[PDB]
């Protein structure tokens, strides 16, 4: 499976799922300074949507 | 039966013809109509999101990705063909449209009298739009259609009112839902008691009702809510928010709405333009926060038909998302789609010309709302 | 001098040193900005105020004092400074 | 000036007792480092 | 010295009543409008063109519903825009139309029914 697809260039995850680990637990807004706390409500951005492009459309069509 | 499920719109097919007419206290120049656009971006409250004829809803529903059929009558003249060609171009089914070759479309014969020193008119012959008979109903449409939609304009015609309740009987027999979009015409604003008696029978037959904030307050008590909005505490505000002197978005309690509630009613929607959509179900109630921006395009903004786009957006999601009736979170997300449709509809001169497509509405919804509210 | 002006503000302009109940961020801002712009905090007040920027540290500090959270929330609304001579009504 | 950016997603690990608390010119709390501190990111 | 920019006259309910009671020879077209109604902007331009075509062969007048709301309701106005075509022959009944009808449709009513 893996490490054979990676050797040949066949489609495969960039990171091996078996050798993949979580990131434990991080600061939960009570052990954090004010400037590093997540806002309670999501903030409108105007950058909140992914930019459409040719690459996204062709990759999906090739995926089907 | 193909998908999406069919919807039927019942009433008169007209070009423009805003039915809801009241008195505004801020008139522009009587001749210079170039000033009149200033009333489009500072509108009367009853005209913030005006409704129109049922043919507007059918056209708007199709552009939003649904399928619709119009049930009504037109004359056999040239203007009747133009109205039918308008709906065929918009891919609205017209098998339910009947022709009256002996009548002139949108023409009413009336006689002028001078009773008690004042000029009045009385109807001599109703137009073909208000003369559809029960024997002329297309039962194939009423069998297939899942939502039956009509306005209160049909209650001003003795012929249509009798025909309306036969159409409702057939639709309920076939499992269709009844959508009452009030849109009170000019005569029905005269007095609360006469209007409530006139609409009570059709109100009780409806499963879904859409009314404006002005219509709802008029039907319950117009002066009580006007006094409520004008109240200002004498010494200090009851809370910090009351200090900001913001616009009033009062959410009516289900006990205030109780005189208008009945057993068969599944969803009541009260629209404050596109700014607020108050929704009421037997189990829950709430409000969807919306917005409007006609000042973004001051020279093409026109609010006419935006009420029809909101109603069409509601019916588009009700047919495809039946869980809106029972899930509050799902209902709020789907109603934001209707808000977006109303917003786009206000950016173009002309109701039909400006009705938005589904992808444009979906794009605006994702641009306006944060991703967690989609 | 800075004795008559203070008296003048009290009598003529109604000045009083009313208590300012500050958040930890506001308390840190006033204690740290007295030292410089970008410098190692040295004063014990600013160092403690830096620690108090995390509510988790405050909860640990509260438990070590044996009081509850609400009592600590009430101790910040306390009148500072000296007290007036107690009344003697005859 | 030079800004150090995180090369990967992950969790920052260092001894806060080896650095000196400070306030930045943007009003944020931070640490002043006067040694060759070793900071770990577990990706 | 300067020609006026608008041909359609605005009339009160009292003035309109005298015009209807009085003797007329040309067809009388009455427009009900409101400055806040979006479609009335389009209707206003069509009636000005209709006034140019029918110089003295017709009389075009308009009534504001903000000023004559009670009068409009008694005239069976159900919405805006609404047009009344009143024949000079007192026996013939008037024709009431609803919506933004085409200019040619107005001409056919005036020529064939008025």
Helix axes B54-63, B78-89, angle to 10 degrees: 30
> In sequence order, what are the beta bridge partners of B228?
none
Residue with tokens 């427009």: E31
Residue A36 contacts C, CB cutoff 8 Å: no
Contacts of A47 in chain B (CB under 8 A): none
Burial class (CB in 10 A: 0-12, 13-18, 19+), D10: middle
B359 phi and psi angles, rounded to 5 deg: -70, -40
Please indicate whether, in this complex, the C-beta atoms of B370 and A49 are within 8 angstroms of each other. no
**Chain center to CA of E15:** 14
The separation between CA E35 and the C-alpha centre of its own chain, rounded to angstroms, equals 15
At D20, is the secondary structure helix, strand, or coil? Answer: strand
Q: Do A33 and D11 touch (CB under 8 A)?
A: no
With an 8 Å Cβ cutoff, are C25 and A34 in contact? yes
E104 flagged as catalytic: no
DSSP states of E49-76 as a string? HHHHHSSSS-EEEEEETTTSHHHHHHTT
- DSSP 8-state class, residue B258: G
Structure tokens at D3: 């800004």
Pair B10, B164: CB distance under 8 Å = yes
Q: Token match 């008169």: residue? A: B12
Identify the residue whose tokens are 């309740």: B165
E96 token code pair: 């009431």
Q: Which chain D residues contact residue A24 at CB under 8 A? A: 11, 42
Which of helix, strand or coil describes residue B226? Answer: helix
Q: In angstroms, what is the resolution?
A: 2.5
Nearest partner of E5 among B27, B28, B30, judged by Cα: B30
Please say whether the beta carbons of D25 and C38 come within 8 A.
Answer: yes
Identify the active-site residue in E16, E28, E30, E40: E40
Q: Do chains C and D touch (3 or more CB pairs under 8 A)?
A: yes
CA distance D35 to chain A (A): 23
The C-alpha atoms of residue E33 and residue E26 are separated, in whole angstroms, by 22
**Bridge-based pairing state of the strands B177-181 and B208-212:** parallel
Residue numbers in C near D21 (CB within 8 A): 40-41, 47, 50
Return the SS3 of B285.
Answer: strand
For this PDB entry, the determination method is cryo-EM
E15 is catalytic: no
Chain A, 22 to 61: residues with Cβ < 8 Å from chain B are 42-46, 48-49
């Amino acid at each position: 499976g893996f490490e054979l697809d990676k050797k040949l260039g066949r489609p495969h995850p960039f990171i091996d799922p078996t050798k993949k680990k979580q990131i434990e637990t991080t600061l939960t807004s009570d052990e954090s300074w004010w400037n590093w706390r997540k806002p309670e409500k999501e903030q409108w951005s105007r950058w909140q949507r992914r930019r459409p492009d040719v690459e996204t459309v062709f990759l999906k069509a090739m995926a089907e | 039966y193909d998908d999406p499920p069919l919807v039927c719109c019942f009433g008169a097919v007209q070009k423009e013809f805003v039915p809801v007419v009241r008195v505004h206290d801020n008139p522009m120049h009587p001749d210079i109509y170039s000033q009149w656009k200033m009333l489009q971006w500072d509108p009367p409250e009853f005209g913030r999101a005006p409704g129109g004829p049922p043919s507007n809803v059918a056209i708007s529903h199709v552009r939003l990705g649904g399928r619709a059929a119009f049930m009504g009558k037109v004359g056999g003249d040239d203007y009747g063909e133009e109205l039918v060609l308008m709906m065929n171009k918009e891919r609205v089914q017209t098998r339910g449209v009947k022709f009256d070759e002996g009548a002139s479309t949108a023409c009413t014969r009336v006689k002028i009298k001078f009773e008690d020193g004042k000029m009045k008119a009385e109807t001599v012959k109703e137009p073909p739009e208000d003369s559809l008979l029960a024997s002329e109903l297309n039962l194939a449409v009423l069998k297939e259609a899942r939502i039956f939609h009509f306005n209160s304009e049909v209650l001003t015609s003795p012929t249509m009112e009798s025909t309306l309740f036969k159409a409702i009987q057939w639709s309920k027999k076939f499992g269709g839902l009844i959508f009452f979009d009030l849109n009170l015409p000019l005569p029905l604003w005269r007095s609360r008691n006469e209007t409530r008696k006139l609409i009570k029978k059709s109100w009780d037959e409806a499963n879904i009702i859409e009314v404006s904030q002005q219509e709802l307050e008029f039907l319950l008590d117009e002066e009580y809510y006007e006094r409520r909005r004008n109240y200002t505490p004498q010494y200090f505000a009851e809370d910090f928010e009351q200090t900001k002197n913001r616009r009033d978005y009062y959410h009516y309690t289900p006990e205030e709405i109780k005189p208008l509630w009945h057993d068969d009613l599944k969803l009541l929607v009260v629209t404050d333009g596109t700014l607020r959509l108050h929704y009421y179900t037997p189990k829950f109630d709430g409000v969807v926060v919306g917005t409007e921006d006609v000042l973004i395009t001051p020279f093409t903004c026109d609010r006419t038909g935006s009420g029809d786009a909101v109603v069409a957006g509601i019916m588009r999601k009700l047919t495809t998302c039946p869980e809106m009736f029972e899930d509050q979170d799902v209902l709020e997300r789907q109603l934001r789609f209707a808000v977006a449709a109303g917003i786009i509809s206000q950016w173009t001169i002309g109701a039909v010309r400006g009705f938005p497509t589904e992808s444009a509405t979906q794009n605006l919804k994702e641009q306006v709302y944060v991703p967690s509210m989609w | 001098t800075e004795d008559e002006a203070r008296r003048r503000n009290w009598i003529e302009r109604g000045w009083a040193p009313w208590e300012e109940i500050l958040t930890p961020e506001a308390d840190f801002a006033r204690k740290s900005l007295n030292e410089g712009e970008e410098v190692p905090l040295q004063s014990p007040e600013a160092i403690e105020a830096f620690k108090m920027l995390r509510p988790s540290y405050r909860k640990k500090k509260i438990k070590e004092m044996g009081i509850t959270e609400d009592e600590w929330y009430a101790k910040q609304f306390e009148i500072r400074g000296d007290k007036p001579p107690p009344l003697d009504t005859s | 000036a030079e800004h150090v950016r995180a090369p990967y997603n992950g969790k920052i690990k260092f001894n806060e007792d080896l650095v000196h608390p400070t306030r930045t010119r943007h009003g944020h709390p931070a640490f002043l480092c006067y040694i060759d501190l070793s900071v770990i990111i577990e990706s | 010295f300067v020609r006026e920019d608008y041909l359609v006259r605005k009339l009160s309910a009292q003035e309109l009543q005298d015009l209807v009671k009085g003797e007329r020879k040309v067809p009388l077209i009455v427009d009900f409008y409101a400055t806040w109604c979006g479609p009335c902007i389009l209707m206003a331009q069509e009636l000005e063109m209709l006034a140019v075509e029918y110089e003295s062969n017709a009389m075009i007048v308009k009534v504001d519903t903000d000023d004559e709301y009670e009068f409009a309701r008694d005239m069976q106005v159900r919405g805006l825009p609404t047009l009344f075509f009143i024949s000079p022959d007192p026996s013939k009944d008037a024709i009431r139309t609803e919506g933004l009808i085409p200019l040619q449709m107005m001409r056919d009513i005036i020529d064939n029914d008025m």
